[PDB]
Design a protein around this ligand. Structure first.
Ligand code: CHL
Ligand code: CHL
Ligand code: CHL
Ligand code: CLA
Ligand code: CLA
Ligand code: CLA
Ligand code: CLA
Ligand SMILES: CC1=C[C@H](O)CC(C)(C)[C@H]1/C=C/C(C)=C/C=C/C(C)=C/C=C/C=C(C)/C=C/C=C(C)/C=C/C1=C(C)C[C@H](O)CC1(C)C
Ligand SMILES: CC1=C[C@H](O)CC(C)(C)[C@H]1/C=C/C(C)=C/C=C/C(C)=C/C=C/C=C(C)/C=C/C=C(C)/C=C/C1=C(C)C[C@H](O)CC1(C)C
Ligand SMILES: CC1=C[C@H](O)CC(C)(C)[C@H]1/C=C/C(C)=C/C=C/C(C)=C/C=C/C=C(C)/C=C/C=C(C)/C=C/C1=C(C)C[C@H](O)CC1(C)C
Ligand SMILES: CC1=C(/C=C/C(C)=C\C=C\C(C)=C/C=C/C=C(C)\C=C\C=C(C)\C=C\C2=C(C)C[C@@H](O)CC2(C)C)C(C)(C)CCC1
Lengths: 165, 207, 214, 194
């Protein structure tokens, strides 16, 4: 479907990639006694492989003739055809944590600004106050917008030093 | 040196000074601490009580007549079964009619809780009208036997006490029927037979 | 003043004034007066919506489980009603969006400019009613029986009852969704199963709340 | 005033005491604004007069026995014929709609075109051929509004009986008269829950 990308469940190459990859570990298991830690380990690698090479197909990961799962980026294609778990959903997840980290950082910076010598609280971080601002970034999107709709997120253009034109 | 206390040896709740009839100083959950609410809650005790006095005399009586046999097949119907018992109209029609009837009396009475002394007057007949009375005690036609002169105070402390007992009574009837599944007189007879083994504990343990 | 947690440090912008001001703004979200005002309206709307929804999921259910009605599960009624009414999802939703959009628009502008919907000439004959009293309290066409006009302390009681009941209903809706998401049953079913063996039927023993691999 | 909606209240004060039909019933306070006061007054009387005509037509046709109000607007769906007082009329759906629009447009427009406002409610003159408005007009207006309010409520009743009972208003009336305790809105199965 999509761009000639066959589902890995119906992808023969994906199946061969399993057969040949587990055979390559079931040939390294033979040169070891049945109970040796070497062999307990290679049997875990075979089980873990057989689980992954199935968790992927069960997730409906379309793969090409190569037999390697491919991802869909277009939101419409990903959503309309149930491929949202790939790229799409992950996208917001990173954005939330990314903005969380950035928002918490600016909260701390703007608190140490003013406070006595702000330059000595950047090298010797105030771990107490840094630990009181981390959770404040949980609802960062709510607070960030409230700052846009109040003109406090940015600085006035007549208070930022600029290089001579 | 004051009113009777629900538990002799305990202090009277500050809000409960004794002005209210039957003010035996009993508000552990401080439900009626708010004076404004104390006023509503007081009227609600009267109405809930008066209606339960009629409800208790509306269950014990039919069963009493049924037990004596004096009561007709209608009395032979247990109160918790009277609903299914047929009469002349289906259960729905009776409820709807009583609703319209209740709406007039209830709204007319409320006019008195909201503006005290503003409903005592026959709408159809301007000449007819109730005399001034405490919110909750209509008087006039509502007191045809004219007992509103002979010791109203102790006849009022007689009502609240009976009302409170009748309210606990209607609670017992439902609770006993909820567990025993029998009429109140049946449960009472079950007790007076073996009273030292038909206690709620023994019954619930057997359940 | 009662606080969400005894000994918790009251913020500063949460001075006992808003209904339910227990001094709970740990992440200082309502620091901005305007933000606090919008959040206040948002809370009331959320609580009122949840209260009128949990009443439509619990009440109808408790009566179905008592033989009075036959309403389907909240997580199945949608399809039942769709096949029952015959209206297509698309058309049904679109119409709702337009109607809700118009009423939200009027309330939205009333916040932007307080008591503005009562503009002379706007809504044919009714603009006056569209005045509003305080943030999330459009007294007048709403509250017809005038229960918020008795005293200045019955308002403050009836308003603490809306917020505490709302907050509870809002959490209740979240619970119902999570309960069905993990248990796979209706809310009453979950409560009944819990009361059966209370010490053996909890979120821990559901299999989804905590995916215990170790 | 003509009375009190809730004997013992006094809340309505914006309503003038001379307003015809002033029973002092404004629970949501919609008459506070004088412009809205005039508009609502005119709307009420108009609604009353129409409802009074509708009620007379809805039952009248049944009295004479030429059909019920609901059956009137159906022939056009089945492509039948219009028949007034039994006598046939040679028209159809679109032509009737067009003729109605133009007539109502030219008439209602002129009524609203009025500026005195009082005339918009009570025009008289050509609208007063018998000139019964020579005296006792102030109370005859109360009769017009009271009957009119009743007519509007009665019209809702006809629709509700047809919606739940389904039978015609006259038929439903006889059903209640014949079986009052048995037949009622309580036993229609729509008025009460579920
Ligand atoms: C304080 C008032 C009041 C009380 C305590 C009761 C109590 C009772 N009614 Mg009831 N009723 C009351 C008012 C009224 N009933 C009815 C009409 C009925 C009917 C038709 C029936 C009852 C029945 C019952 C009994 C079974 C409960 C029930 O209906 O399950 C319903 C359960 C759920 C709704 C859940 C019960 C003891 C039933 C009965 O006696 O049958 C054995 C019954 O069939 N009532 C009307 C309409 C006139 C009432 C008031 O207007
Ligand atoms: C807060 C609002 C709201 C909530 C919580 C729900 C919740 C639900 N609705 Mg729903 N609805 C809501 C508003 C509305 N619904 C509908 C119309 C319908 C219909 C017609 C149906 C539902 C159904 C459902 C259930 C299944 C959802 C679905 O189809 O997913 C399908 C997706 C999956 C199964 C994939 C997994 C999803 C999971 C969240 C992850 C579900 C519990 C369905 C139902 O009755 O359930 C049997 C159903 O058929 N709703 C309308 C009209 C436009 C709504 C609002 O206007
Ligand atoms: C000419 C363009 C025009 C536009 C864009 C709007 C837009 C709007 N008017 Mg509006 N009006 C316009 C002309 C006029 N209005 C009015 C009289 C009113 C009144 C009386 C009211 C509005 C209101 C509104 C808002 C209703 C919100 C809503 O229903 O959204 C719901 C969302 C939808 C219906 C979806 C829209 C679909 C989209 C167009 C197509 C698909 C994408 C809305 C933003 C309401 C309001 O909020 O006022 C404060 C309101 O009460 N208008 C008059 C006569 C005086 C107009 C004359 O030209
Ligand atoms: C980041 C840039 C970007 C790019 C390059 C594309 C590119 C594309 N998108 Mg898209 N999209 C984007 C962002 C982007 N999108 C975002 C941010 C959203 C969220 C709002 C969407 C939501 C979206 C939807 C819902 C759909 C697409 C679809 C498409 C494809 C055809 C639609 C079109 O003509 O133009 C681009 C269209 C949009 C950007 C959004 C409008 C939705 C389109 C116009 C509806 C078209 C439906 C129809 C089936 C498309 C025919 C494609 C053709 C091969 C048959 C196309 C390759 C369609 C698709 O192929 O999925 C099946 C489609 O249904 N996108
Ligand atoms: C509070 C910390 C913080 C924040 C909020 C930002 C924010 C931003 N940076 Mg930046 N940066 C930072 C630290 C930070 N930076 C540090 C420490 C360095 C030195 C390595 C840089 C070097 C840097 C460069 C070279 C550039 C940016 C750029 C940008 C902008 C592009 C957005 C982006 O993708 O981020 C980008 C972030 C990076 C590329 C690296 C920083 C990532 C670190 C890990 C985040 C800082 C975490 C901080 C230590 C937490 C402090 C918590 C406190 C309690 C101690 C953005 C507004 C770009 C820009 O200017 O856009 C126009 C760009 O060119 N940053
Ligand atoms: C719904 C019935 C009802 C109501 C509204 C009241 C109301 C009131 N009672 Mg009362 N009482 C009742 C039933 C009721 N009672 C019964 C059945 C008894 C017998 C045990 C008593 C015995 C009693 C005593 C001895 C006294 C009162 C007193 C009072 C007043 C004190 C203020 C107060 O407690 O807050 C209001 C209380 C309520 C609103 C009760 C609500 C009903 C509860 C919440 C139901 C809970 C289930 C229940 C346990 C069964 C008040 C106006 C005191 C007083 O001064 O009298 C004027 C006092 O001395 N009551
Ligand atoms: C969308 C629902 C909603 C909204 C908009 C609000 C808004 C508000 N609440 Mg509130 N609250 C809610 C639900 C909500 N609450 C629920 C369900 C409960 C029950 C636990 C409470 C219990 C509560 C208490 C005890 C107190 C408040 C207080 C406040 C005010 C403090 C300012 C603030 O924090 O900004 C608003 C907050 C936000 C905009 C953040 C949005 C919520 C985030 C994004 C969700 C994150 C998860 C969340 C914690 C739980 C849901 C899952 C504020 C206006 C304080 C107050 O009354 O001061 C006057 C206070 O004392 N709330
Ligand atoms: C005071 C206090 C204070 C603190 O703080 C806290 C606390 C302690 C909690 C409190 C207490 C409270 C209480 C106890 C209350 C109670 C109430 C009641 C029980 C009522 C009744 C109530 C009851 C009632 C009304 C009753 C009713 C009934 C009726 C109508 C009727 C019935 C019947 C009869 C006749 C018979 C038939 O065949 C059937 C019928 C018809 C069905
Ligand atoms: C304005 C107006 C006007 C004039 O004034 C008068 C009047 C008419 C009166 C008014 C009105 C008002 C209203 C509407 C109100 C409403 C209310 C509500 C509904 C509430 C709810 C409320 C609701 C709520 C709280 C809710 C609750 C719930 C809950 C807890 C739940 C729980 C649970 C969970 C989670 C889960 C599980 O599995 C089960 C359970 C365990 C069960
Ligand atoms: C005072 C107050 C105060 C506060 O604040 C608020 C509120 C409450 C809102 C207010 C109230 C109001 C009201 C009550 C209203 C009502 C209305 C109506 C019912 C109308 C009707 C209305 C109705 C009407 C017009 C009617 C109409 C009718 C017509 C034309 C006609 C019909 C017909 C007939 C002849 C027969 C044929 O075969 C068919 C047809 C052709 C179909
Ligand atoms: C749907 C989506 C994608 C679609 C992208 C498309 C079509 C357009 C994207 C436009 C984008 C991504 C960005 C435009 C940004 C423009 C501006 C002016 C925004 C700047 C953001 C700012 C200034 C915020 C900075 C932050 C503040 C102040 C505090 C903290 O939040 C931290 C921080 C630094 C984030 C694709 C690529 C398909 C992929 C799938 C997700």
């Amino acid at each position: 479907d999509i761009a000639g990308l066959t589902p890995c469940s119906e992808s023969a190459a994906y199946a061969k990639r399993l057969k040949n990859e587990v055979k390559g570990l079931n040939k390294r298991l033979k040169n070891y006694e049945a109970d040796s830690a070497p062999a307990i380990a290679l049997k875990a690698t075979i089980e873990r492989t057989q689980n992954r090479f199935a968790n992927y197909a069960k997730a409906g990961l379309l793969c090409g003739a190569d037999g390697l799962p491919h991802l869909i980026s277009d939101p419409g294609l990903a959503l309309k055809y149930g491929h949202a778990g790939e790229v799409f959903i992950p996208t917001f997840g990173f954005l939330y944590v990314a903005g969380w980290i950035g928002y918490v950082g600016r909260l701390y910076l703007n608190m140490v600004k003013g406070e006595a010598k702000p330059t000595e609280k950047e090298i010797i971080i105030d771990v107490p106050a840094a630990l009181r601002l981390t959770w404040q970034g949980a609802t960062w999107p709510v607070q960030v917008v409230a700052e846009l709709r109040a003109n406090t997120l940015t600085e006035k253009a007549e208070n930022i030093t600029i290089s001579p034109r | 040196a004051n009113r009777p206390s629900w538990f002799p040896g305990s202090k009277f709740p500050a809000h409960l000074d004794g002005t209210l009839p039957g003010d035996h100083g009993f508000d552990p959950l401080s439900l009626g601490v708010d004076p404004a609410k104390l006023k509503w809650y007081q009227q609600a005790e009267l109405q809930n009580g008066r209606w339960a006095m009629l409800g208790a005399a509306g269950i014990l009586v039919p069963d009493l007549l049924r037990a004596v046999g004096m009561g007709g097949p209608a009395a032979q119907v247990p109160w918790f079964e009277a609903g299914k018992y047929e009469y002349f109209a289906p259960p729905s029609a009776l409820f709807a009619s009583m609703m319209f009837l209740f709406a007039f009396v209830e709204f007319r009475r409320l006019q008195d809780i909201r503006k005290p002394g503003s409903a005592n007057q026959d709408p159809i007949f301007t000449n007819n009208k109730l005399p001034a009375g405490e919110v909750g005690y209509p008087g006039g036609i509502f007191d045809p036997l004219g007992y509103s002169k002979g010791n109203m105070e102790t006849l009022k402390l007689k009502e609240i006490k009976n009302a409170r007992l009748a309210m606990l009574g209607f609670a017992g009837f439902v609770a006993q029927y909820q567990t025993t599944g029998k009429t109140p007189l049946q449960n009472l007879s079950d007790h007076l037979a073996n009273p030292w083994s038909t206690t709620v504990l023994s019954n619930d343990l057997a359940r | 003043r009662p606080l969400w947690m005894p000994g918790a440090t009251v913020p500063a912008h949460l001075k006992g004034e808003l209904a339910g001001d227990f001094g709970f703004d740990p992440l200082n979200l309502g620091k901005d007066p305007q933000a606090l005002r919008w959040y206040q309206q948002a809370e009331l709307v959320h609580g009122r919506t949840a209260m009128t929804a949990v009443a439509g999921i619990l009440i109808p259910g408790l009566l179905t489980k008592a033989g009075v009605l036959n309403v389907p599960e909240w997580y199945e009624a949608g399809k039942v009603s769709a096949e029952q009414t015959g209206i297509a999802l698309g058309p049904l939703l679109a119409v709702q969006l337009f109607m809700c959009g118009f009423v939200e628009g009027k309330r939205w502008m009333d916040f932007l400019k307080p008591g503005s919907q009562s503009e002379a000439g706007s809504f044919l004959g009714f603009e006056a009613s569209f005045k509003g009293t305080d943030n999330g309290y459009p007294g007048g066409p709403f509250d017809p029986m005038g229960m918020c006009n008795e005293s200045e302390a019955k308002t403050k009681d009836l308003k603490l009852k809306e917020i505490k009941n709302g907050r509870l209903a809002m959490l209740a809706c979240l619970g119902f969704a999570a309960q069905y998401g993990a248990t796979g049953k209706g809310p009453l079913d979950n409560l009944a199963d819990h009361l059966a063996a209370p010490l053996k039927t909890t979120f821990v023993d559901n299999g989804i709340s905590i995916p215990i691999h170790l | 005033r003509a009375g009190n909606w809730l004997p013992g209240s006094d809340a309505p004060a914006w309503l003038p005491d001379d307003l015809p039909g002033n029973y002092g019933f404004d629970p949501l306070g919609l008459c506070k604004d004088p412009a809205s006061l005039k508009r609502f007054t005119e709307s009420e009387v108009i609604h009353c007069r129409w409802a009074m005509l509708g009620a007379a037509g809805c039952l009248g046709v049944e009295a004479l026995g030429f059909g019920n109000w609901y059956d009137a607007p159906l022939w056009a769906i089945n492509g039948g014929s219009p028949t007034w007082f039994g006598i046939s009329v040679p028209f159809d759906l679109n032509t009737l709609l067009a003729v109605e629009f133009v007539a109502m447009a030219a008439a209602e427009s002129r009524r609203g075109d009025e500026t005195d406002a009082a005339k918009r409610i009570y025009p008289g003159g050509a609208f007063d051929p018998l000139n019964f408005a020579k005296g006792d007009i102030e109370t005859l207006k109360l009769k017009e509004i009271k009957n009119g309010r009743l007519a509007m409520m009665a019209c809702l009743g006809f629709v509700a009986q047809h919606a739940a009972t389904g039978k015609t208003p006259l038929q439903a009336l006889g059903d209640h008269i014949g079986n009052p305790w048995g037949s009622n809105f309580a036993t229609n199965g729509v008025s009460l829950p579920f």
